[PDB]
Structures are given as C-alpha cells and as structure tokens.
Amino acid sequence: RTHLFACGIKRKSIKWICRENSEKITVCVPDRKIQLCIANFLNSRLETMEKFKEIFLISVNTEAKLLYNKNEGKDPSIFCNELRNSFSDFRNSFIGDDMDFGGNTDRVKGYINKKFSDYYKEKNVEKLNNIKKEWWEKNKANLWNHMIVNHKGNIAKECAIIPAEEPQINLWIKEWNENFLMEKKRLFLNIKDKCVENKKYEACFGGCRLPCSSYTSFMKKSKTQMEVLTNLYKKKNSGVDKNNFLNDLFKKNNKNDLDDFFKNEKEYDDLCDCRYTATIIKSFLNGPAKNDVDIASQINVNDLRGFGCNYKSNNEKSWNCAGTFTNKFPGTCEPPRRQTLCLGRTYLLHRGHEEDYKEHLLGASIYEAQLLKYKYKEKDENALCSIIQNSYADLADIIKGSDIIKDYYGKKMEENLNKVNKDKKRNEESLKIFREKWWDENKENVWKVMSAVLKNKETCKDYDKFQKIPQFLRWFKEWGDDFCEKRKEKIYSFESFKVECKKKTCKNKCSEYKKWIDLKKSEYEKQVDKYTKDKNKKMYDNIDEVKEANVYLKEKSKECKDVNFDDKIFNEAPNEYEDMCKKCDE
Ligand SMILES: CC(=O)N[C@H]1[C@H]([C@H](O)[C@H](O)CO)O[C@@](O)(C(=O)O)C[C@@H]1O
Numbered sequence: 001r002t003h004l005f006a007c008g009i010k011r012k013s014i015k016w017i018c019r020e021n022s023e024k025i026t027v028c029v030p031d032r033k034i035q036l037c038i039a040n041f042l043n044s045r046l047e048t049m050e051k052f053k054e055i056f057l058i059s060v061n062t063e064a065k066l067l068y069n070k071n072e073g074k075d076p077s078i079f080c081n082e083l084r085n086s087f088s089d090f091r092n093s094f095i096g097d098d099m100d101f102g103g104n105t106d107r108v109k110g111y112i113n114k115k116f117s118d119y120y121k122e123k124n125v126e127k128l129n130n131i132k133k134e135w136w137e138k139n140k141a142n143l144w145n146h147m148i149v150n151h152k153g154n155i156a157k158e159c160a161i162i163p164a165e166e167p168q169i170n171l172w173i174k175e176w177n178e179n180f181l182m183e184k185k186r187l188f189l190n191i192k193d194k195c196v197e198n199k200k201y202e203a204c205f206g207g208c209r210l211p212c213s214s215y216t217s218f219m220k221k222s223k224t225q226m227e228v229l230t231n232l233y234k235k236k237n238s239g240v241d242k243n244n245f246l247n248d249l250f251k252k253n254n255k256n257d258l259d260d261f262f263k264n265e266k267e268y269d270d271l272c273d274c275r276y277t278a279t280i281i282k283s284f285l286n287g288p289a290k291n292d293v294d295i296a297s298q299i300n301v302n303d304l305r306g307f308g309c310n311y312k313s314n315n316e317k318s319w320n321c322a323g324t325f326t327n328k329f330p331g332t333c334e335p336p337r338r339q340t341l342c343l344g345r346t347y348l349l350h351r352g353h354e355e356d357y358k359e360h361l362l363g364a365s366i367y368e369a370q371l372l373k374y375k376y377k378e379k380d381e382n383a384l385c386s387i388i389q390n391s392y393a394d395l396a397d398i399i400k401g402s403d404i405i406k407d408y409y410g411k412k413m414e415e416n417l418n419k420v421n422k423d424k425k426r427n428e429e430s431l432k433i434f435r436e437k438w439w440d441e442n443k444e445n446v447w448k449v450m451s452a453v454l455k456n457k458e459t460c461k462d463y464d465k466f467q468k469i470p471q472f473l474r475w476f477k478e479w480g481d482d483f484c485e486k487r488k489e490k491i492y493s494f495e496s497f498k499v500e501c502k503k504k505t506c507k508n509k510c511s512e513y514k515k516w517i518d519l520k521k522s523e524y525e526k527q528v529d530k531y532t533k534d535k536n537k538k539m540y541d542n543i544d545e546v547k548e549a550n551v552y553l554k555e556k557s558k559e560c561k562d563v564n565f566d567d568k569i570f571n572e573a574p575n576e577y578e579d580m581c582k583k584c585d586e
C-alpha cells in the first residue's frame, strides 16, 4: 500500500490533454501518461544501482495494479493495451524519448539523470542516453515479466508477450486512434438510440440533439488533437510520413486524409438535423432552393406545422388598433400580416444555444417567406418584394426588441435571445445593444433565405435600409397601399355589379361598404394622429422625405398614386356611386 499511495488512484475517464512545452510546440499527452507511476523514484534515495533496479520493479508492478483497478468493468482489451502502452512509456521516458513534460515527468527525469551521472560518473547527456538504453535492453525482460506477474491470468496469452520497441509518438498515435474509434462508437450509439431514424422529428428535441451535439464537440476536439499528433510525426520523421504510417492508418479506417477522416457522413445529418429547420435552411443557403425559386416556393406541410405555423388564412383580419400595445403606443395599427408573422414554437429557443436560436430564426424566416409567396403568388415582383421586406423588418424589430406589439410569441423571440446572452449585466440598454449587434451579424443571412422566393432575387433593394425605418412608419404605408387597393377592388365590384343589373338589393352591397369605409376611417384617424403628434415631438428628424400624413402616403404608397385624401374619400359611398347608392328603390 505504501507504494500504491505514492502514485494515486487512476482516473477511469480516458482523455488526452494538450499543452505547449517551453519550445512553443503544442503536444498532446494521454492522461494515462500523466498518472504514470513514477512517484516511488522520489521517495527513495536510490543509494545503489540495485536499489534503482528495485524501485523500478515497484514502479511497473504498481502501475499494473492501478491500471487493473482502473479497468474494472471495461473490456479486457483495454487493460491489455494500457499495460503495454505504459511499459512503453517507462522505456521511452527513461531513454530520453518523451513528449510529456512538467510535474513529476521532469522531476523524476532530472533525478534519474543525476543519479546515473553519479553511478557511471558521466555527465555527458548523449552518453548517458546510450548508457540508459543499454541498461534497459538488459533489464527490460525482468521489468516486463514483473509488471504483469500478478495479471498474467487477466490478459490474453498474446498480450503477455513483451511489447515491441517503437518510437513514443508511433505508439501514442496508435493508442489515440483506438480511444477515438472506441469513443466514437459509444457516442454514435447514443445518437441512434435517442434519434432512432429522425422520421418523427426526434432531431428537433433535446433527446436527440443533445447526444448529437455531444458527438459534434468530440469530433472537433479529436480533429485538433490528431492534427497535432500528425504534425509531430512528420516533424520527428524529417517532415515525411515515413513508412506511410499515416497514409496507411487512414486507409485502415476507410478514410483518405484528416479532413475526410472527420467529414460527417450522410448518416449523421439524417439523424441529427431537425428536418423542419436545418434541412431547409441548408437548402436555401446552399442546396437547390438557393438558386431555384420554384423549389424554394414548394412548401412541406408536415415540416411547416411541425415548426408551428400554418397557411395564411384565405380570410382577411382587420387591422388591430385596440391591442395592449396601444397603451404605450396609441394610434398604432398592427398589420394583419404582422398579427400572423411566423415565429414558431420548438425547443431551440428554450435552452438558449446561440446556434439553436439561429437555426430557429432562419426556420421562421423561411416559412414566413414561403407562406407569403403562396398567398400573394399572383402579384408582381415589385409588389411581392415590399411584402417580404415588411416581415423582414418586423423580424428585425422583434429581435432588436423595438417591436411595438410585444405579443406573446413576440416577446418569446426577444427574451429567448436574452437567454443566449450569457453576460451577467442584464439591464435594458445592455440587453438591447447585444440583440441589436446579434441582428447585424445574422440579418444578412435572414434576408438571403427570405429573398429566395423571388424570381429575380436582386429586385428587392434597400431591404436593410428599409428595416432601419421606424416600425410604425413602415406600417402606416402598408396600411395606405392596402386601403387604396381594397378601395379599387370594391369600386370594381360596383362596376361589375352595376352592369350586371343594368342588363338583367343595392342597399345591401352599399350597407356593407358603408360599414367598411367607416372602419377604415377610424384606423386612418388613429394613425394620422400618432403621425402628427410624433412629428411635433421631433422623432422623425433623422429621416429624409418625411420631415402631412395624407401627403406622405401618396408619394410612398405606390397604390395611392392616383388618389387624393379629401373628405369625399371616406364617404359612405364613392362620389360616382354617391347618388347610385342612393335611390335604392330601383
Ligand atoms: C505531477 C504529475 O506529473 N503527475 C502526478 C499526477 C498529476 O499531478 C495529477 O494527477 C494531475 O496533473 O497526480 C498523481 O498524484 C496521480 O495521478 O497519481 C501522481 C502523478 O505523479
């Protein structure tokens, strides 16, 4: 026990630590090497050579015990490999061939070198190295035999044979490989177990996403680690892959080079990619949808409703001018489009993972664009364009947190981005700037996917400059173009109806129109008020082509290009139909 305590219990978890030595050279040492039993050398004065021989026998024999206890419950092949890899480190480290440093690795190295400088009375480093190599050659047999003396019956007969002498890195690359593949299995098994086939959108929930992301971080670490182990082999072998050691190692696993060695297989994406978010996002940013508008328009209902959205109802909702938001922003009217802006539900927002929130926002941005395209599919490109921008701008204000509505799912969008913010300073002005910056980092991508549903993608200009326009102002225009459009429609309805009767209950058609125009009149008044009251407060000083409400509409509202704002416009019946709505006796 006196010897076992000197070393210390081994950590079952297999991990490779990567530091940089005094030569600015990055190296990756296995945890097994770090805990290599070498403390006994320090607890002994090492009086004579025979004493050194004795302590060494204890060092290796003790190493076997702790390794055995370490691998209780594991595959016996591990205990076999670790014995051989540790015995190899006892050699390599003892003959000057070592990458590991710090701690007792150098504290024992220096001591051993010093005692050997006293034993042989030789202080030449190179000479000593040879002396030690010769000593090992003549003591390696007795060391190995004594190392596995109490564990011969716990390893295969083939493992009982003394390990072949090889360079340290040659053995570390081998060991690291077995640890990599072994760990890659376990992790991927948990993926299959939790993701199944990802046909029921398992990859969109923690159950499958967590193990998938755990596998991801493992591949990232593994790659960087092997990149080092790779460079060290080349460097130690004259910058050459001598004996095609690496080239072979790659083909042994059916891979070409490092890059391909970590290239996520098609299988992974099929199980870890939320098919109603990631799959489409990739299609819009890289795949078919990116270029083909027809493909970017085709909607997948299952994925749509899986995300938490639905087709824009054929019906038309009235502009909300009596929401709770009106309390702080009186006069504002929420566009029906905004009332149904696709934000989704999902599990990505909750956790607060930057990439997950990004994956969701893009998902919503896409669906929104698709649904709009499916609704206003019969509108010109110039019109459809401004419609996409209207939502793109709303999204911006929702993220930034400058949205006027602050609806349930609206806040959820903002507040969930605050969860992504791991900063501990959480005041309004602080959380604001954070989101505002985060938007600038992704606003370009958000637009790329949304603009993918337009025949000519570069028809929409100043989409970003449009977002910088105050929300209310953007809506007041949308209301103008809307009202004017539906006005022309209702006028065409009268012309098409008047002639129908002219050849072969006018009060009814009118009555319906009388109630409509009155409703639109109040929506016009509420906004016009806010526009004037806000103008006097000097809120729109930093806005060109703005510094009368009715006038502001004409120029901007392209639809109202042939309409003036008199008192006649809000009459119970059009001027040309004023006398016609009257005399309904006919
Ligand atoms: C200093 C050094 O290089 N190795 C020593 C390690 C490490 O200090 C820590 O385990 C993590 O660094 O700890 C030991 O107590 C142990 O693992 O049994 C002894 C060993 O000699």
Ligand SMILES: CC(=O)N[C@H]1[C@H]([C@H](O)[C@H](O)CO)O[C@@](O)(C(=O)O)C[C@@H]1O
Binding pocket: 308, 309, 310, 311, 338, 339, 340, 341, 342, 343, 344, 407, 409, 410
């Ligand atoms: C709350 C919100 O802004 N938009 C949501 C809307 C609104 O709840 C309704 O349209 C009523 O306003 O409903 C959805 O189910 C939908 O349109 O597919 C999801 C969408 O995210």
